[PDB]
Amino acid sequence: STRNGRDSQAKRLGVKRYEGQVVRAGNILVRQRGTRFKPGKNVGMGRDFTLFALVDGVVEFQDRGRLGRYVHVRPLA
């Protein structure tokens, strides 16, 4: 007779498009709770903090020291 045995259906978080991968405008690039990663160039983020491409291009992960981490998208030039 216990008092536990509970949990929540996993949510499958994290980067969902890595640096150098080609996307299309719309692709959600990152799923995360806080803001582990922040919007960048052509990268708006959503209500739930979900970063998503804003234009067809590639993904770049700029690490900005104590300024956080960024995910940009340099469109195809």
Add this chain to the structure above:
Amino acid sequence: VPARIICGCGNVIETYSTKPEIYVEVCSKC
């Protein structure tokens, strides 16, 4: 507005505040 400090220990004080009709029953005389 300016004012006047009319103690009792003589000594009047011309300065400012409100109502130049002040009966300071005891200025700096103790």
Add this chain to the structure above:
Amino acid sequence: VRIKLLLECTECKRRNYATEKNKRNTPNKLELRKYCPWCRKHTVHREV
């Protein structure tokens, strides 16, 4: 909830609705705001 309660909004003499949720007890005792109707555009809007 109970003190909560559901409710919508009527375009003032007519149809359409919004259906939000008032909140009894606290800021209550009736309530209306401005919102856009499927027909024409923007007006007040009462509960019911």
Add this chain to the structure above:
Amino acid sequence: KRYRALLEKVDPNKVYTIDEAARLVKELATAKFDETVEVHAKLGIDPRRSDQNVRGTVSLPHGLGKQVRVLAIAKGEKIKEAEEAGADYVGGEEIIQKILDGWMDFDAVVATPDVMGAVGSKLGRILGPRGLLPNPKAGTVGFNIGEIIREIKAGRIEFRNDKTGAIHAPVGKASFPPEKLADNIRAFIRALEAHKPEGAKGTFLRSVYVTTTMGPSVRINPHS
């Protein structure tokens, strides 16, 4: 006599349509002062059924004015909101002393919960059977006192069923612009209809009229 030539202005058999009794309700009242248009209606309920009593107010589109002295009994700067609202009389548990001993020159009485305690505790039996005491249902209690006070001036009046199973309530003045009172009436009905005690068997509004402060009372169809 004098009402005879005054009573002929009513078809005892007929059923009017608000409007019908509107042009009329003005020809019905004639006095040496502005008569207030009263309204009565035998609602279908039982007093003895504690639940079915009807206590509710309504903000009117037309009519009703500062023809009332409201007292806001509160603590804090609530007073500031109240006084700025139009609180003829202001002051908490110090004004209770005014009223408690003699004083009595107002109509309404708003208040704040925080100081509400002492009120009904030491004012219960006085203004209690007077219906003046602050009651939520009859929205004269609370903190948003602002709108509250500011509103008992625009057009919000109470109306609690009596013991006979009837309810009455002034819908406006006699020299009122034609379609105003007639419109001011539906406002009163639509709100009282909107308050039907869940277990009220039979037909609700059974007898609804349109009277004048002094005289004639033309019964109408409360669905007109």
Add this chain to the structure above:
Amino acid sequence: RRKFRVRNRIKRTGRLRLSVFRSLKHIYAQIIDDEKGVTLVSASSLALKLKGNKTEVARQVGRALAEKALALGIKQVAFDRGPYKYHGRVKALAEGAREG
């Protein structure tokens, strides 16, 4: 450990900032293009001499930055100034189709 936050900028998403500076005696203003870290157009206050009102002086350096700008391709920008408070000193200059 930081007096005023500013960053009314930082909220700069739309390219080409009209970066202003409120000096006690003068006023400078440059049309910076980040994502490149280069200043495309300047035009300072007393670093051009000009009149002696202060605000009427700004108005000038404004029209001076606009005219200069335009003839470079510029025509669309975004205002700024940290403690800009967008008041008095405002340079609601003609030209420069950046609106506002």
Add this chain to the structure above:
Amino acid sequence: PLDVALKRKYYEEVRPELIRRFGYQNVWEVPRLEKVVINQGLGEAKEDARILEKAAQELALITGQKPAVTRAKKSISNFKLRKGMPIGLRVTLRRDRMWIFLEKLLNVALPRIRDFRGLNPNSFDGRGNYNLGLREQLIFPEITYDMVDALRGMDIAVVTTAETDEEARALLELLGFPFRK
């Protein structure tokens, strides 16, 4: 009013000494007055409708600056009143309001204070600033005994660009601040 009896004294009677005293180099660098604060806790925003504005129109009646109604930041069970609004009254004096005030205080106020045998000399300490309290509020001229339903003490805090106490001490001392010495 841009100038007062004390203001002058500072400039042409204190300014000199301090310099000659500690030997300052730059003009500025020598002790000046920044601001003198006067607040009241009251703690009386309890029941009975705590108006206590009289204490506000008064605090300022002797100052000439309607005070700022501070409120409780946290909330305390122990002594009723909590979470917000309730109590708090305080005004900040600068420039000329600062001078035309300290004068009276030092000339007419401090004088009549029950016993008052000078101002406790420890209230400085590391503070290039000073602090002191008053029980009554009638210690001032602009207000009489009759008009004031209840009493009302208050705290007076003078801020100084002084870094040391000696610097602060001397200054307030050359100004006229009596001292429990």
Add this chain to the structure above:
Amino acid sequence: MISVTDLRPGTKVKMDGGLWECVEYQHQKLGRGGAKVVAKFKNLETGATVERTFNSGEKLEDIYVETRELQYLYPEGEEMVFMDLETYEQFAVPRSRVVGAEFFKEGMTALGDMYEGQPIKVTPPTVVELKVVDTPPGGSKPATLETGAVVQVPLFVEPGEVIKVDTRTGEYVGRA
């Protein structure tokens, strides 16, 4: 609709159209049969009790008879009115459902069993203060209290004197 295995004294529920409150609860599972819940109840208005038994399944139907604190205001008809010193609502309770409605007082704070915003039991405190406005200055004499009721008191207790009276026995329990 809560089952029984999940009852606890204090739980209020609706049985036989009436209001109760489990006051005794004991899970019983002897032999290899199915479990059983054997409780004892109390009506909320009448005192009547009744021990009963249920299987593991059987659901009951929880009720919401919370007990706020009301307040007397004034008499009217054969009823008396109170108020929840909380939301200040108005309750017109019929003399019957007001335990010891007499020996009360137009302004005293008592307790009521709110069942859908309508008290079905209004009790004052075991003993309340009341001003005797009667009695001959003459020992164990009758004394009409300000609420019209009468009570037996000693001598010294004379007109105007406020006393105490156990609202359960209406007996003089001392003076104010």
Add this chain to the structure above:
Amino acid sequence: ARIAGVEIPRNKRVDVALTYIYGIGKARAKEALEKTGINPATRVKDLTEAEVVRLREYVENTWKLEGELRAEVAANIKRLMDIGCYRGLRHRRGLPVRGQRTRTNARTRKGPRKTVAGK
């Protein structure tokens, strides 16, 4: 009507109004008015700034009182905090010190009551 130490009496004759001071008994008050030739019967609510001032003159310097006398006496009583003057060893234990009956009464120097049981 603030006198020595802003202690303010009023609306009644000065004679007794002075009494309303810790250091002014009916005596020092009747010997204080003739020494400035004022009318005893006069209501404090009327008297030349001079009458009041030269009044606050005497009073304050004529004798040390309230505040300074008040406080002072406590110190008087302190000194009896020597090593054990029987006049102090009664002051330490809130009890009369002028030889008063102690079995009974002596209440005024011992708060209300403590009772306790019997034998």
Add this chain to the structure above:
RNA sequence: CGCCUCCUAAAAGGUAACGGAGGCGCCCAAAGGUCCCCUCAGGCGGGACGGAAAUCCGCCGGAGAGCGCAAGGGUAGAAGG
């Protein structure tokens, strides 16, 4: 017995047990938009009633505060006031 959080879960995701440990069935007409402002908790002084934090002043304090509620990620170049 459905839902959320953390661990187990073996550095992508996912992953069991009558494994460990907690939450929810709501709530806000401002606790929502937007625009402009402000920066905390604590700590050492310093101060009338004033605990040990009521209100005030001075420094020191990058986040230990806060963000309605569990926990987690998040966050003062605000998501806080």
Add this chain to the structure above:
RNA sequence: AAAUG
């Protein structure tokens, strides 16, 4: 009405 030593 009203116990005991």
Add this chain to the structure above:
RNA sequence: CGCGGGGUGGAGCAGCCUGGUAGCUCGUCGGGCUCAUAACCCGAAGGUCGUCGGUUCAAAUCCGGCCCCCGCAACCA
């Protein structure tokens, strides 16, 4: 080994869901009535709310771990 409820003045019970309130009866000590003792009348004192944690602005109360408490079960072999 589980199943539910209980530890509150000296005794026996309220109060706990609906957090800001210690309610009752007896007992105790003081004082009267009596020659005296009861009774009876007058008045008073007394509760870490089992403990140790946590939640809250605050807890007897809400939350957990323990300690004692009372009652119920332990069946098919």
